[PDB]
């Protein structure tokens, strides 16, 4: 029922080759070391992986730990920013928590809402993983949100990404510092994402 979808999360952008055991061990350890659990023991009960679409559903033992796990949206796992989302069929019942109450230091959200400070970064080498692209962008300070767009068929980046800095006032310096930058065989395009949005 609805309680059960209130204990499940979509986890996108899972690395190639990840087993159920590896995902379980990662999420259980990180939730406990991050203080996101509410009771003794492991909070994740099951993982179902779809290797063809690089997503998993995790099932948790409680509604509140499911909600807290949303604070791991963007956590890096084997170089890739995991996308943590509510199931499409999820609807909170009255009294059910909806938003995580904790911020996990170092975790950069994958949700980049349109805004005056949202950047588009194009022309990235397709072999750079999420962490490596973030590393480049953090030359100008910490990120508030970031997503690298992937190719479903090749299991690899499409060469473009979106981001926003914690300090919105560095946006034009980052454009100036990165736009036209020669990176491997390509030259970066960095501009506000509203310039070229379809």
PDB file of C-alpha atoms in Angstrom:
ATOM      1  CA  UNK A   1       0.000   0.000   0.000  1.00  0.00           C
ATOM      2  CA  UNK A   2       0.976   3.648   0.444  1.00  0.00           C
ATOM      3  CA  UNK A   3       3.058   2.897   3.521  1.00  0.00           C
ATOM      4  CA  UNK A   4       5.202   0.628   1.349  1.00  0.00           C
ATOM      5  CA  UNK A   5       5.907   3.248  -1.312  1.00  0.00           C
ATOM      6  CA  UNK A   6       6.671   5.544   1.648  1.00  0.00           C
ATOM      7  CA  UNK A   7       9.524   3.118   2.402  1.00  0.00           C
ATOM      8  CA  UNK A   8      11.033   2.995  -1.117  1.00  0.00           C
ATOM      9  CA  UNK A   9      13.360   5.263  -3.060  1.00  0.00           C
ATOM     10  CA  UNK A  10      14.494   5.431  -6.651  1.00  0.00           C
ATOM     11  CA  UNK A  11      18.304   5.550  -6.863  1.00  0.00           C
ATOM     12  CA  UNK A  12      19.471   6.594 -10.328  1.00  0.00           C
ATOM     13  CA  UNK A  13      22.865   6.799 -12.044  1.00  0.00           C
ATOM     14  CA  UNK A  14      24.170   3.636 -10.419  1.00  0.00           C
ATOM     15  CA  UNK A  15      27.637   2.600 -11.687  1.00  0.00           C
ATOM     16  CA  UNK A  16      28.060  -0.320 -14.035  1.00  0.00           C
ATOM     17  CA  UNK A  17      28.713  -3.602 -12.282  1.00  0.00           C
ATOM     18  CA  UNK A  18      27.187  -2.767  -8.909  1.00  0.00           C
ATOM     19  CA  UNK A  19      25.662  -5.725  -7.080  1.00  0.00           C
ATOM     20  CA  UNK A  20      22.790  -5.687  -4.629  1.00  0.00           C
ATOM     21  CA  UNK A  21      25.282  -6.524  -1.893  1.00  0.00           C
ATOM     22  CA  UNK A  22      27.541  -3.576  -2.768  1.00  0.00           C
ATOM     23  CA  UNK A  23      24.610  -1.138  -2.809  1.00  0.00           C
ATOM     24  CA  UNK A  24      23.225  -2.471   0.486  1.00  0.00           C
ATOM     25  CA  UNK A  25      26.570  -2.311   2.239  1.00  0.00           C
ATOM     26  CA  UNK A  26      27.218   1.230   0.987  1.00  0.00           C
ATOM     27  CA  UNK A  27      23.838   2.686   1.919  1.00  0.00           C
ATOM     28  CA  UNK A  28      23.580   0.938   5.291  1.00  0.00           C
ATOM     29  CA  UNK A  29      27.091   1.988   6.327  1.00  0.00           C
ATOM     30  CA  UNK A  30      26.751   5.549   5.100  1.00  0.00           C
ATOM     31  CA  UNK A  31      23.382   6.059   6.776  1.00  0.00           C
ATOM     32  CA  UNK A  32      24.728   4.782  10.077  1.00  0.00           C
ATOM     33  CA  UNK A  33      28.013   6.685   9.878  1.00  0.00           C
ATOM     34  CA  UNK A  34      26.050   9.762   8.815  1.00  0.00           C
ATOM     35  CA  UNK A  35      23.695   9.547  11.777  1.00  0.00           C
ATOM     36  CA  UNK A  36      20.617   9.181   9.567  1.00  0.00           C
ATOM     37  CA  UNK A  37      19.240   6.090  11.323  1.00  0.00           C
ATOM     38  CA  UNK A  38      16.709   6.227  14.128  1.00  0.00           C
ATOM     39  CA  UNK A  39      17.154   2.786  15.714  1.00  0.00           C
ATOM     40  CA  UNK A  40      19.861   0.148  16.159  1.00  0.00           C
ATOM     41  CA  UNK A  41      20.973  -1.812  13.105  1.00  0.00           C
ATOM     42  CA  UNK A  42      20.728  -1.472   9.340  1.00  0.00           C
ATOM     43  CA  UNK A  43      17.955   0.670   7.832  1.00  0.00           C
ATOM     44  CA  UNK A  44      17.839  -0.754   4.282  1.00  0.00           C
ATOM     45  CA  UNK A  45      15.898  -3.979   3.856  1.00  0.00           C
ATOM     46  CA  UNK A  46      16.139  -4.659   0.111  1.00  0.00           C
ATOM     47  CA  UNK A  47      17.615  -3.395  -3.161  1.00  0.00           C
ATOM     48  CA  UNK A  48      16.342  -4.180  -6.651  1.00  0.00           C
ATOM     49  CA  UNK A  49      18.756  -3.243  -9.439  1.00  0.00           C
ATOM     50  CA  UNK A  50      17.905  -2.732 -13.081  1.00  0.00           C
ATOM     51  CA  UNK A  51      21.297  -2.999 -14.825  1.00  0.00           C
ATOM     52  CA  UNK A  52      19.781  -2.012 -18.177  1.00  0.00           C
ATOM     53  CA  UNK A  53      18.678   1.423 -16.948  1.00  0.00           C
ATOM     54  CA  UNK A  54      21.236   1.973 -14.174  1.00  0.00           C
ATOM     55  CA  UNK A  55      18.683   2.468 -11.411  1.00  0.00           C
ATOM     56  CA  UNK A  56      17.689   0.677  -8.275  1.00  0.00           C
ATOM     57  CA  UNK A  57      14.860   0.791  -5.807  1.00  0.00           C
ATOM     58  CA  UNK A  58      15.854   0.634  -2.169  1.00  0.00           C
ATOM     59  CA  UNK A  59      13.344  -0.462   0.433  1.00  0.00           C
ATOM     60  CA  UNK A  60      13.835   0.772   3.984  1.00  0.00           C
ATOM     61  CA  UNK A  61      12.553  -0.477   7.278  1.00  0.00           C
ATOM     62  CA  UNK A  62      10.855   2.797   8.214  1.00  0.00           C
ATOM     63  CA  UNK A  63       9.150   5.830   6.732  1.00  0.00           C
ATOM     64  CA  UNK A  64      11.327   8.298   8.574  1.00  0.00           C
ATOM     65  CA  UNK A  65      14.637   6.692   7.583  1.00  0.00           C
ATOM     66  CA  UNK A  66      13.404   6.626   3.994  1.00  0.00           C
ATOM     67  CA  UNK A  67      12.811  10.378   4.220  1.00  0.00           C
ATOM     68  CA  UNK A  68      16.191  11.002   5.829  1.00  0.00           C
ATOM     69  CA  UNK A  69      17.913   9.018   3.066  1.00  0.00           C
ATOM     70  CA  UNK A  70      16.787  11.719   0.598  1.00  0.00           C
ATOM     71  CA  UNK A  71      19.580  13.798   2.138  1.00  0.00           C
ATOM     72  CA  UNK A  72      21.976  11.515   0.219  1.00  0.00           C
ATOM     73  CA  UNK A  73      20.779  12.799  -3.162  1.00  0.00           C
ATOM     74  CA  UNK A  74      24.074  13.383  -5.004  1.00  0.00           C
ATOM     75  CA  UNK A  75      26.236  11.183  -2.762  1.00  0.00           C
ATOM     76  CA  UNK A  76      29.239   9.924  -4.756  1.00  0.00           C
ATOM     77  CA  UNK A  77      29.446   6.138  -5.198  1.00  0.00           C
ATOM     78  CA  UNK A  78      32.345   4.883  -7.356  1.00  0.00           C
ATOM     79  CA  UNK A  79      32.682   8.354  -8.890  1.00  0.00           C
ATOM     80  CA  UNK A  80      28.988   8.763  -9.776  1.00  0.00           C
ATOM     81  CA  UNK A  81      26.437  11.137  -8.231  1.00  0.00           C
ATOM     82  CA  UNK A  82      23.524   8.969  -7.127  1.00  0.00           C
ATOM     83  CA  UNK A  83      20.114  10.435  -7.902  1.00  0.00           C
ATOM     84  CA  UNK A  84      17.744   9.805  -5.028  1.00  0.00           C
ATOM     85  CA  UNK A  85      14.070  10.440  -5.750  1.00  0.00           C
ATOM     86  CA  UNK A  86      10.690   9.490  -4.379  1.00  0.00           C
ATOM     87  CA  UNK A  87       8.943   6.717  -6.300  1.00  0.00           C
ATOM     88  CA  UNK A  88       6.476   8.065  -8.853  1.00  0.00           C
ATOM     89  CA  UNK A  89       3.702   6.139  -7.078  1.00  0.00           C
ATOM     90  CA  UNK A  90       4.538   7.658  -3.698  1.00  0.00           C
ATOM     91  CA  UNK A  91       2.032   9.725  -1.840  1.00  0.00           C
ATOM     92  CA  UNK A  92       2.635  10.754   1.786  1.00  0.00           C
ATOM     93  CA  UNK A  93      -0.213  10.023   4.162  1.00  0.00           C
ATOM     94  CA  UNK A  94      -1.042  12.608   6.836  1.00  0.00           C
ATOM     95  CA  UNK A  95       1.571  12.497   9.554  1.00  0.00           C
ATOM     96  CA  UNK A  96       4.223  11.050   7.211  1.00  0.00           C
ATOM     97  CA  UNK A  97       7.501  13.001   7.057  1.00  0.00           C
ATOM     98  CA  UNK A  98       8.327  14.435   3.617  1.00  0.00           C
ATOM     99  CA  UNK A  99      11.623  16.330   3.757  1.00  0.00           C
ATOM    100  CA  UNK A 100      14.898  15.253   5.381  1.00  0.00           C
ATOM    101  CA  UNK A 101      15.744  17.099   8.563  1.00  0.00           C
ATOM    102  CA  UNK A 102      19.509  16.774   8.249  1.00  0.00           C
ATOM    103  CA  UNK A 103      22.019  18.159   5.779  1.00  0.00           C
ATOM    104  CA  UNK A 104      24.974  15.844   5.088  1.00  0.00           C
ATOM    105  CA  UNK A 105      28.205  17.868   4.630  1.00  0.00           C
ATOM    106  CA  UNK A 106      29.841  17.344   1.289  1.00  0.00           C
ATOM    107  CA  UNK A 107      26.729  15.970  -0.466  1.00  0.00           C
ATOM    108  CA  UNK A 108      25.781  18.084  -3.502  1.00  0.00           C
ATOM    109  CA  UNK A 109      22.175  17.799  -4.649  1.00  0.00           C
ATOM    110  CA  UNK A 110      21.494  16.532  -8.186  1.00  0.00           C
ATOM    111  CA  UNK A 111      18.408  18.757  -8.524  1.00  0.00           C
ATOM    112  CA  UNK A 112      19.409  21.944 -10.346  1.00  0.00           C
ATOM    113  CA  UNK A 113      16.324  24.183 -10.635  1.00  0.00           C
ATOM    114  CA  UNK A 114      16.233  26.843 -13.320  1.00  0.00           C
ATOM    115  CA  UNK A 115      17.483  30.131 -11.938  1.00  0.00           C
ATOM    116  CA  UNK A 116      19.558  33.174 -12.711  1.00  0.00           C
ATOM    117  CA  UNK A 117      22.654  31.335 -11.440  1.00  0.00           C
ATOM    118  CA  UNK A 118      22.203  27.919 -13.080  1.00  0.00           C
ATOM    119  CA  UNK A 119      25.034  27.144 -15.467  1.00  0.00           C
ATOM    120  CA  UNK A 120      25.237  24.871 -18.499  1.00  0.00           C
ATOM    121  CA  UNK A 121      28.623  23.242 -19.128  1.00  0.00           C
ATOM    122  CA  UNK A 122      29.022  21.703 -22.571  1.00  0.00           C
ATOM    123  CA  UNK A 123      31.892  20.069 -24.415  1.00  0.00           C
ATOM    124  CA  UNK A 124      33.119  17.903 -21.544  1.00  0.00           C
ATOM    125  CA  UNK A 125      35.097  14.782 -22.520  1.00  0.00           C
ATOM    126  CA  UNK A 126      32.627  11.931 -22.369  1.00  0.00           C
ATOM    127  CA  UNK A 127      34.926   9.817 -20.198  1.00  0.00           C
ATOM    128  CA  UNK A 128      35.011  12.207 -17.235  1.00  0.00           C
ATOM    129  CA  UNK A 129      32.858  10.883 -14.423  1.00  0.00           C
ATOM    130  CA  UNK A 130      30.587  12.941 -12.159  1.00  0.00           C
ATOM    131  CA  UNK A 131      33.248  13.403  -9.473  1.00  0.00           C
ATOM    132  CA  UNK A 132      35.880  14.522 -12.000  1.00  0.00           C
ATOM    133  CA  UNK A 133      33.545  17.067 -13.564  1.00  0.00           C
ATOM    134  CA  UNK A 134      32.614  18.386 -10.113  1.00  0.00           C
ATOM    135  CA  UNK A 135      36.319  18.589  -9.318  1.00  0.00           C
ATOM    136  CA  UNK A 136      36.796  20.903 -12.302  1.00  0.00           C
ATOM    137  CA  UNK A 137      33.842  23.109 -11.396  1.00  0.00           C
ATOM    138  CA  UNK A 138      34.835  23.398  -7.731  1.00  0.00           C
ATOM    139  CA  UNK A 139      37.939  25.282  -8.873  1.00  0.00           C
ATOM    140  CA  UNK A 140      35.590  28.231  -8.246  1.00  0.00           C
ATOM    141  CA  UNK A 141      34.140  27.101  -4.922  1.00  0.00           C
ATOM    142  CA  UNK A 142      31.604  24.605  -3.598  1.00  0.00           C
ATOM    143  CA  UNK A 143      28.567  23.561  -5.591  1.00  0.00           C
ATOM    144  CA  UNK A 144      24.972  23.805  -4.398  1.00  0.00           C
ATOM    145  CA  UNK A 145      23.651  21.431  -7.087  1.00  0.00           C
ATOM    146  CA  UNK A 146      25.073  19.518 -10.022  1.00  0.00           C
ATOM    147  CA  UNK A 147      24.001  16.923 -12.579  1.00  0.00           C
ATOM    148  CA  UNK A 148      26.020  15.348 -15.384  1.00  0.00           C
ATOM    149  CA  UNK A 149      23.789  14.036 -18.170  1.00  0.00           C
ATOM    150  CA  UNK A 150      24.353  10.394 -19.089  1.00  0.00           C
ATOM    151  CA  UNK A 151      23.813   8.335 -22.232  1.00  0.00           C
ATOM    152  CA  UNK A 152      21.610   5.322 -21.514  1.00  0.00           C
ATOM    153  CA  UNK A 153      23.046   3.320 -24.405  1.00  0.00           C
ATOM    154  CA  UNK A 154      26.784   3.792 -23.836  1.00  0.00           C
ATOM    155  CA  UNK A 155      26.673   3.928 -20.041  1.00  0.00           C
ATOM    156  CA  UNK A 156      28.679   7.118 -20.354  1.00  0.00           C
ATOM    157  CA  UNK A 157      28.384  10.902 -20.107  1.00  0.00           C
ATOM    158  CA  UNK A 158      26.759  12.956 -22.896  1.00  0.00           C
ATOM    159  CA  UNK A 159      29.423  15.585 -22.327  1.00  0.00           C
ATOM    160  CA  UNK A 160      27.257  18.258 -20.684  1.00  0.00           C
ATOM    161  CA  UNK A 161      26.170  19.177 -17.176  1.00  0.00           C
ATOM    162  CA  UNK A 162      24.319  21.762 -15.111  1.00  0.00           C
ATOM    163  CA  UNK A 163      25.335  23.308 -11.817  1.00  0.00           C
ATOM    164  CA  UNK A 164      24.933  26.163  -9.377  1.00  0.00           C
ATOM    165  CA  UNK A 165      27.467  27.444  -6.858  1.00  0.00           C
ATOM    166  CA  UNK A 166      26.823  27.886  -3.157  1.00  0.00           C
ATOM    167  CA  UNK A 167      28.102  31.466  -3.582  1.00  0.00           C
ATOM    168  CA  UNK A 168      25.990  32.793  -6.429  1.00  0.00           C
ATOM    169  CA  UNK A 169      28.342  35.748  -6.846  1.00  0.00           C
ATOM    170  CA  UNK A 170      31.101  33.536  -8.287  1.00  0.00           C
ATOM    171  CA  UNK A 171      28.936  32.621 -11.270  1.00  0.00           C
ATOM    172  CA  UNK A 172      30.413  35.126 -13.715  1.00  0.00           C
ATOM    173  CA  UNK A 173      33.977  34.398 -12.611  1.00  0.00           C
ATOM    174  CA  UNK A 174      33.366  30.716 -13.255  1.00  0.00           C
ATOM    175  CA  UNK A 175      31.939  31.478 -16.713  1.00  0.00           C
ATOM    176  CA  UNK A 176      34.981  33.632 -17.459  1.00  0.00           C
ATOM    177  CA  UNK A 177      37.401  31.093 -16.028  1.00  0.00           C
ATOM    178  CA  UNK A 178      35.908  28.035 -17.762  1.00  0.00           C
ATOM    179  CA  UNK A 179      34.139  29.174 -20.954  1.00  0.00           C
ATOM    180  CA  UNK A 180      36.279  28.286 -23.961  1.00  0.00           C
ATOM    181  CA  UNK A 181      38.668  26.274 -21.805  1.00  0.00           C
ATOM    182  CA  UNK A 182      40.517  23.640 -23.832  1.00  0.00           C
ATOM    183  CA  UNK A 183      39.865  20.282 -22.173  1.00  0.00           C
ATOM    184  CA  UNK A 184      41.358  17.404 -24.095  1.00  0.00           C
ATOM    185  CA  UNK A 185      40.153  17.589 -27.680  1.00  0.00           C
ATOM    186  CA  UNK A 186      37.174  19.838 -26.915  1.00  0.00           C
ATOM    187  CA  UNK A 187      36.625  23.423 -25.812  1.00  0.00           C
ATOM    188  CA  UNK A 188      34.187  23.991 -22.961  1.00  0.00           C
ATOM    189  CA  UNK A 189      31.029  26.029 -23.403  1.00  0.00           C
ATOM    190  CA  UNK A 190      30.011  27.568 -20.060  1.00  0.00           C
ATOM    191  CA  UNK A 191      27.084  29.981 -19.877  1.00  0.00           C
ATOM    192  CA  UNK A 192      23.890  30.508 -17.947  1.00  0.00           C
ATOM    193  CA  UNK A 193      21.619  27.614 -18.789  1.00  0.00           C
ATOM    194  CA  UNK A 194      18.783  29.942 -19.757  1.00  0.00           C
ATOM    195  CA  UNK A 195      20.802  31.113 -22.800  1.00  0.00           C
ATOM    196  CA  UNK A 196      20.410  27.777 -24.596  1.00  0.00           C
ATOM    197  CA  UNK A 197      17.502  25.963 -22.989  1.00  0.00           C
ATOM    198  CA  UNK A 198      14.999  24.333 -25.341  1.00  0.00           C
TER     199      UNK A 198
END
